[PDB]
Amino acid sequence: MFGLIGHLTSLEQARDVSRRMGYDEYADQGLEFWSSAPPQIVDEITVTSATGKVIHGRYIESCFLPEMLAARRFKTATRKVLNAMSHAQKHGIDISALGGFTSIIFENFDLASLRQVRDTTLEFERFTTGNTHTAYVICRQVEAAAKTLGIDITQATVAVVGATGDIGSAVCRWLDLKLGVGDLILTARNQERLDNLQAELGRGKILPLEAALPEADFIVWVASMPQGVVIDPATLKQPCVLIDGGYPKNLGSKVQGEGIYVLNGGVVEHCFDIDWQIMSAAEMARPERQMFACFAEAMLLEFEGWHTNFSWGRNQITIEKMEAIGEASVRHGFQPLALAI
Amino acid sequence: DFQSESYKDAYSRINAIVIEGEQEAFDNYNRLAEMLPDQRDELHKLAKMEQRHMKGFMACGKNLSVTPDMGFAQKFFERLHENFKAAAAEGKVVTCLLIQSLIIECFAIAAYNIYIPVADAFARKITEGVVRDEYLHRNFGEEWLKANFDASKAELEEANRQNLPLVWLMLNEVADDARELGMERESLVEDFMIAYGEALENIGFTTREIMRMSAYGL
Ligand SMILES: *C(=O)CCCCCCCCCCCCCCCCC
Ligand SMILES: CCCCCCCCCCCCCCCCO
Ligand SMILES: [Fe+2]
Ligand SMILES: [Fe+2]
């Protein structure tokens, strides 16, 4: 049994998705109610691999909302994640993806040292962040978008916004060693983490966001932003490819214009219909086929029988792990989401 | 953290609530023993194990130099007492079980869990003893109603509607009180909903049912 632990992107989305399912009690209430709400299994999932193997899974709603962080409800947010993980273990789920901000909260607030949740002791090998698969998928999306637009990736500039993060640092390593990208712009908040990533990569310029934007042919957005920034088209090159891998989306608005291509980063599409409701709630273009890559990782781990915390922690993702999850990804029938033309 | 000044004021009513709570539990379980003959022995066991908790919390009010306001605590439980006595008088055992082994137990589970990490060392040690018993009392109500689920469902839904809103009123009454002891209302609601939703799932309710039932009155 695999598990998917996620959360909604806003209170308005949470109230809308609740009302659209039968959950009217959650649709009528505000932040304080969500702050005390328990985790809930709200979807049963069956997936068939291209190899024919059938797996089963469950979606767990954590009831975390990004506004909790802006309202500084840091302890609330911590409980949402720990209660959701405890819920997965109590129900005997073998491997669960910590989607979206639940993995970020887990790391930023050192939740490893809080692993006793009521009568439960969390077993970290039953969880993955899914970040290895997300980093792999985003790299394939860069590669394919470049071929699709007639851009030579070895002659082009890629800016990685969030380059010090777990996903961002993996993408940088693969863009360097497997794609031979022309040049790499590293962008992030922590100077020391940037300095260290530049050393370990042996290349890349460090630039603030406002100076990275106008220089980039591709911008990979993998920043841990609760909110989403507003980018004016006029500041960007033409053509520019925005790969927005954030959840919530790093692009707080629709960036549309001449020579601007926006791609939902870290999304895969399956060769078979999947019977479930949660990707409709997530506004995938094809909600019966498409899903976030971190959730696909949990499916891959269950397909392969790799019941372990395959993606864990921060900055531990290696090229060989990305290659391994990527081969499993193709084999079981997943393909990276491509530019929509 | 002080264990000084207002903490004793607040602790007077809280300790009172827990004594009376454990008292109401002793009685409710005795009357259930009459109401269910074929488990009269088993119920009498849980009932006695409750008096032991009451002694334990008497002790907690002792070595912290607190005198518990037994009047306040009796007003605190009046409605649920009133609802219990009337249901038992009418022979409605399904409703009695929900009040005592589901609602009141999960109230205690939530309260004590939240209390332990902010308790002084002595009360914390004792509190940690009781909390695991309460989970076992919960499981008695759980397993009975689970055996008689089809026959009991409608009355459970009715008793949830009649009594769960009292929990919310009670948590509001005692809120800022409980804050002085270092315990947040938000965490109390969550722990209650977690433990109550759990018992309901074991009993047979589905997720949308539990979500409707657990939030009723909130
Ligand atoms: C992975 O890489 C990022 C994953 C992001 C998290 C995706 C969560 C999708 C939302 C699922 C839909 C929620 C529906 C249940 C709402 C229930 C409310 C009571
Ligand atoms: C202990 C402080 C918690 C604050 C919440 C109010 C006091 C506790 C609620 C009442 C608990 C009653 C439990 C009685 C025994 C149930 O088996
Ligand atoms: Fe008790
Ligand atoms: Fe009890």
PDB file of C-alpha atoms in Angstrom, chain A residues 22-23 25-26 35-36 38 40-41 73 76 79-80 83 91 118-119, chain B residues 113 135 186-187 189-191 193-194 198 201 207-208 211-212 215 218:
ATOM      1  CA  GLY A  22     -18.940  15.969   0.077  1.00  0.00           C
ATOM      2  CA  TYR A  23     -16.964  17.654   2.847  1.00  0.00           C
ATOM      3  CA  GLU A  25     -18.129  20.815   7.238  1.00  0.00           C
ATOM      4  CA  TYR A  26     -14.651  21.840   6.065  1.00  0.00           C
ATOM      5  CA  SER A  35      -5.572  24.484  12.286  1.00  0.00           C
ATOM      6  CA  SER A  36      -7.259  21.954  14.594  1.00  0.00           C
ATOM      7  CA  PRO A  38      -7.336  15.875  12.019  1.00  0.00           C
ATOM      8  CA  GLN A  40      -8.139  12.230   6.784  1.00  0.00           C
ATOM      9  CA  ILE A  41      -7.855   9.473   4.190  1.00  0.00           C
ATOM     10  CA  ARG A  73       1.468  29.225  13.176  1.00  0.00           C
ATOM     11  CA  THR A  76       0.306  24.259  13.987  1.00  0.00           C
ATOM     12  CA  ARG A  79       1.472  19.142  14.023  1.00  0.00           C
ATOM     13  CA  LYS A  80      -0.249  18.891  10.617  1.00  0.00           C
ATOM     14  CA  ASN A  83      -0.327  13.904  12.542  1.00  0.00           C
ATOM     15  CA  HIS A  91      -3.178   2.505   8.742  1.00  0.00           C
ATOM     16  CA  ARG A 118       1.035  10.362  20.794  1.00  0.00           C
ATOM     17  CA  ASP A 119       1.334   6.583  21.035  1.00  0.00           C
TER      18      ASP A 119
ATOM     19  CA  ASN B 113      -2.010  14.244  26.281  1.00  0.00           C
ATOM     20  CA  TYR B 135      -7.494   4.200  25.579  1.00  0.00           C
ATOM     21  CA  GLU B 186      -6.412  24.545  19.324  1.00  0.00           C
ATOM     22  CA  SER B 187      -4.402  21.493  20.380  1.00  0.00           C
ATOM     23  CA  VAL B 189      -9.758  20.328  19.766  1.00  0.00           C
ATOM     24  CA  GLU B 190      -7.359  18.484  17.458  1.00  0.00           C
ATOM     25  CA  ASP B 191      -6.495  15.735  19.936  1.00  0.00           C
ATOM     26  CA  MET B 193     -11.110  14.984  17.093  1.00  0.00           C
ATOM     27  CA  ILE B 194      -8.240  12.577  16.436  1.00  0.00           C
ATOM     28  CA  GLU B 198     -10.479   6.954  15.561  1.00  0.00           C
ATOM     29  CA  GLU B 201     -13.795   4.351  12.426  1.00  0.00           C
ATOM     30  CA  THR B 207     -14.746   8.779   6.599  1.00  0.00           C
ATOM     31  CA  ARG B 208     -17.433  11.145   5.343  1.00  0.00           C
ATOM     32  CA  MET B 211     -16.115  14.044   9.210  1.00  0.00           C
ATOM     33  CA  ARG B 212     -19.773  15.012   9.507  1.00  0.00           C
ATOM     34  CA  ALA B 215     -17.322  18.508  13.494  1.00  0.00           C
ATOM     35  CA  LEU B 218     -18.064  23.228  15.869  1.00  0.00           C
TER      36      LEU B 218
END
